[PDB]
């Protein structure tokens, strides 16, 4: 244990980087960019105001993340208390389920890509990853599973469109706009078929 | 005070809105309709020519009933002003 | 790498501190062989050291902040 | 010959302002962050991942890329200061050699031509003998060349996608469909089946090799 | 007559709180920032150099193009006045002079007139007796007008690109293809080929 | 001020775009009506014909008028600014 | 003073929007063309000079 | 500068526009023209049908002709950049 | 060619050398040298601390300078 | 013709010229001429302190003021 007024300047300035911990360690960059993709689906770019969206990526992000900080609690937060184990022993024990969440949301190649940009030959086992190599990677691992998410959504919307457009040209119609007909029977089938808890459910199943 | 001097306060704005709105909007309309009549009378089908006397309709438009709709725009902003004080709460 | 060297300037930080608080703490029984002198050198040179390590954590929070700013 | 220590403090503490500055000039973050900018303009959504995601992920492959050089100046300069070997002044002498030589490597001649013409030096005996004052600038400019052309050839598959649907909506009648709207999916397709973002950082790191 | 040490390092530290106003308007730092901005809106890219890429590029041609005043200063004012052969008075007296020749030779006579009217000074005989309170406004102005002339000029290639994009996309029939999205690539590329990034500072360079 | 040293002011402005504005609007009108009687009369089907001769047509007008326009723009402008400190009062 | 600065600017931008959507090029930006042209005019008139004339003759 | 030099820049700019637009223009007016006629002729009504060979024309000109849009539109360019320094005054 | 680097670098170094000076002439002082006054060394202490201030002091200002412009929109 | 840098220029003159004629006085005491007596040198020696630190407060008013003028928002 070192000095009582070196953890609070560690602390505070640990404290700065939330927004970094927020996005590049939780899954917080999937959620907002699945819902930034599918407000982009209904045609609508500003229909939920973006804290909204936010607001509840945050909340999505929290309860995603309750297992693991329970079992930050278990394995940092009490044993803190009991002194146990502190200081340095925990917060790397209280970090190792990030590192645990992180090893399983994360693609092999992206991991392998980051290993031979550092030169890290003898990295054999997959427990051991450093936190250089695994962060960015992650990031990339989360981006492409938003994307590809995004694309799902972005599925029965295209369909809705092409299929208001081309009953629009068969009916003889050619100079009709589809999106201004479209747009309503969008919302329709998005309430109807509740696709907001559905798209819930399916992010929380993608863990 | 009451949502129901609210409600009526969006309702008579909106319709000082549409009465602003509504000549140069009808104006246009009515140009496009009979350029598009003109057009099917005598089997001419170009998108552009049906463009240009609508801008000249609606620009005359502001020069017949501009004076009024300036006038009832003030008017209304005026007494809004000024009856403020009197719908607080 | 940059996060162990950052990791060895508090050490050392830390240390240089509870040298200066552990020396202070002896006199102040007191314990033969420590002189006043000594002592408020120590706890002036642990202030001095603290000072800079608040001072570099600054600079690194406002570049930290400054290059998170950009518009992409 | 030696600074004093005060005197040392100082110009550490001041030197340590001037850090998203010698980034952004001398570091690789400058042709990545751009392109970045560039690559969420091709995909249609200027959204895209957020602005703070894609900063760190520059940082993250700066540090990457900049990891021999970091090496290099801890080795040769940084190691004799802390193991007291050298003054600061020959540190800062000696520690900049191998970040220049990297800077150089990266730099068109014409922009190196056009600095040393427009500061009126005299005849540079060999890329050992360029100032720093006329390497910076036109680094920079070699870098935002490069990042430009980098990011005008990312924009080629997207345009093809725009192009073949624009082209197939128009074959069929439907005139009056915007394919921006059809095309946006398909261009997520495309960066998603071909590993886009993880072949994009592997081609920058290379480039910059 | 010559200021004690004390009143001359206090009229030290408050010129050199001036300093991001001499910058801004005495040297050419204003025209390039304005034609930076200006370029970096023209190619339908907001924000891809940065603030800070763009400021730095700037303050370095603005010193290497003021390489030469500054050298006539440190020769004819700072020199003497670091050896102790002149006061502080006589030394900022003389180091007005050649960064004045310069503002001179890169104002308009009409923008002085103007100021000079406007301030009621009375005739002034030749460029030699002109106060810095009325030069320095009018140079600004200057300053402004021929960033704008830059700026509109460089603006014609990429509007050139743009229609010839936008009609070749129109005479097809597809009529709802946005052109932003095509000239945006066409854009980067003709500026990527003429090597336009150390043509236009060179561009800059020569017109000072 | 008040509506009418408004109203004139924008009267005369607007009169300003019109005459700038007429010459180009005219010969792409007459230029595209002129394509599409000449299609019609042929009963050729397409709608991309006229595009072409409206972009020479209006090309060409503002090769020819283009001092014209812009000289009549910098005075009215000129003026403008010169009795600029008299709006006010 | 502000309100009729702008209307030449104004006047700029209709007449480029017009003439932009009467040819039939609807799909264009008019502001990234027209902003060139306000420039050109800002130039062409003197405008910054006639500017300080007119604030310094309000008074 | 004066007004003139402005119309003269315009002038050279819009002739170098034309230039660039024209071996492209050209061919697609030609193409969709020959296929309206034709289908005019052969009573075949359906417009898209024109559509599809005039791409392949574009592009046909393109790979004919795009190094010369390409090295033309530079030559300009490089010369406009270097006259910046003697245009102002 | 005058540069700007040049000259803080030199200003660095008479602060340095100004300093080093009258540390070396009060550890003289204190290690019994005959040839030096308690006046002088105390002067020259004074006179270093002087030059250090103005030192820090247009440090300062440079720096509020540069992070004044560096701020800008461009 | 009412130019505030001249002003300025007068009031910083002001100053130096009682700097000037304090620090005179003093080196005259100090070479023993006689006609100068220790009461008005140490007078004089703080009249010309409080015309300096006069100046430093107008001066930092000032500059605190140009400052809050110069940044705000257009």
Request: charge should be neutral; hydrophobic fraction near 55%.
């Given at each position: 244990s070192?000095?009582?007024?070196?953890?609070?300047?560690?602390?505070?300035?640990?404290?700065?980087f939330?927004?970094?911990?927020?996005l590049?360690?939780?899954?917080?960059?999937?959620?907002?960019?699945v819902?930034?993709?599918?407000?982009?689906?209904?045609?609508?770019?500003?229909?939920?105001?973006?804290?909204?969206?936010?607001?509840?990526?945050?909340?999505?992000?929290?309860?995603?993340?309750?297992?693991?900080?329970?079992?930050?609690?278990?394995?940092?937060?009490?044993?803190?208390?009991?002194?146990?184990?502190?200081?340095?022993?925990?917060?790397?024990?209280?970090?190792?389920?990030?590192?645990?969440?992180?090893?399983?949301?994360?693609?092999?190649?992206?991991?392998?890509?980051?290993?031979?940009?550092?030169?890290?030959?003898?990295?054999?086992?997959?427990?051991?990853?450093?936190?250089?190599?695994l962060l960015?990677?992650?990031?990339?691992?989360?981006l492409?599973?938003?994307?590809?998410?995004?694309?799902?959504?972005?599925?029965?919307?295209?369909?809705?469109?092409l299929?208001?457009?081309?009953?629009?040209?068969?009916?003889?119609?050619?100079?009709?706009?589809?999106?201004?007909?479209?747009?309503?029977?969008?919302?329709?089938?998005?309430?109807?078929?509740?696709?907001?808890?559905?798209?819930?459910?399916?992010?929380?199943?993608?863990? | 005070?009451?949502?129901?001097?609210?409600?009526?306060?969006?309702?008579?704005?909106?319709?000082?809105?549409?009465?602003?709105?509504?000549?140069?909007?009808?104006?246009?309309?009515?140009?496009?309709?009979?350029?598009?009549?003109?057009?099917?009378?005598?089997?001419?089908?170009?998108?552009?020519?049906?463009?240009?006397?609508?801008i000249?309709?609606?620009?005359?438009?502001?020069?017949?009933?501009?004076?009024?709709?300036?006038?009832?725009?003030?008017?209304?902003?005026r007494?809004?002003?000024?009856?403020?004080?009197?719908?607080?709460? | 790498?940059?996060?162990?060297?950052?990791?060895?300037?508090?050490?050392?930080?830390?240390?240089?501190?509870?040298?200066?608080?552990?020396?202070?703490?002896?006199?102040?029984?007191?314990?033969?062989?420590?002189?006043?002198?000594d002592?408020?050198?120590?706890?002036?040179?642990?202030?001095?050291?603290?000072?800079?390590?608040i001072?570099?954590r600054?600079?690194?929070?406002?570049?930290?902040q400054?290059?998170?700013?950009?518009?992409?």
């Amino acid at each position: 244990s070192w000095s009582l007024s070196v953890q609070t300047l560690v602390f505070i300035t640990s404290l700065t980087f939330l927004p970094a911990i927020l996005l590049m360690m939780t899954s917080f960059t999937r959620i907002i960019i699945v819902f930034g993709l599918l407000r982009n689906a209904l045609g609508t770019p500003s229909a939920p105001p973006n804290q909204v969206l936010l607001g509840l990526a945050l909340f999505l992000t929290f309860f995603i993340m309750s297992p693991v900080i329970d079992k930050i609690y278990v394995d940092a937060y009490q044993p803190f208390s009991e002194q146990k184990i502190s200081m340095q022993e925990a917060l790397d024990k209280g970090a190792q389920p990030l590192r645990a969440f992180m090893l399983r949301q994360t693609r092999e190649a992206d991991l392998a890509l980051f290993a031979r940009l550092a030169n890290s030959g003898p990295l054999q086992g997959p427990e051991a990853v450093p936190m250089r190599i695994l962060l960015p990677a992650y990031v990339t691992s989360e981006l492409k599973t938003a994307f590809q998410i995004g694309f799902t959504i972005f599925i029965p919307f295209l369909i809705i469109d092409l299929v208001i457009a081309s009953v629009l040209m068969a009916l003889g119609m050619m100079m009709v706009p589809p999106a201004t007909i479209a747009l309503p029977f969008k919302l329709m089938l998005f309430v109807l078929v509740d696709g907001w808890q559905l798209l819930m459910g399916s992010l929380a199943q993608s863990f | 005070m009451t949502p129901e001097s609210v409600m009526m306060m969006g309702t008579e704005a909106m319709k000082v809105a549409l009465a602003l709105a509504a000549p140069l909007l009808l104006v246009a309309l009515i140009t496009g309709l009979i350029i598009s009549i003109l057009q099917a009378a005598t089997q001419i089908n170009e998108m552009t020519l049906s463009f240009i006397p609508k801008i000249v309709a609606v620009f005359i438009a502001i020069i017949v009933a501009g004076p009024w709709m300036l006038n009832l725009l003030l008017d209304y902003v005026r007494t809004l002003f000024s009856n403020l004080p009197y719908i607080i709460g | 790498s940059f996060a162990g060297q950052l990791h060895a300037a508090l050490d050392r930080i830390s240390d240089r501190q509870a040298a200066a608080r552990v020396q202070a703490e002896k006199f102040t029984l007191g314990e033969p062989g420590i002189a006043l002198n000594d002592v408020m050198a120590d706890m002036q040179k642990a202030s001095v050291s603290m000072q800079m390590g608040i001072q570099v954590r600054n600079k690194l929070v406002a570049a930290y902040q400054e290059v998170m700013s950009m518009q992409v």
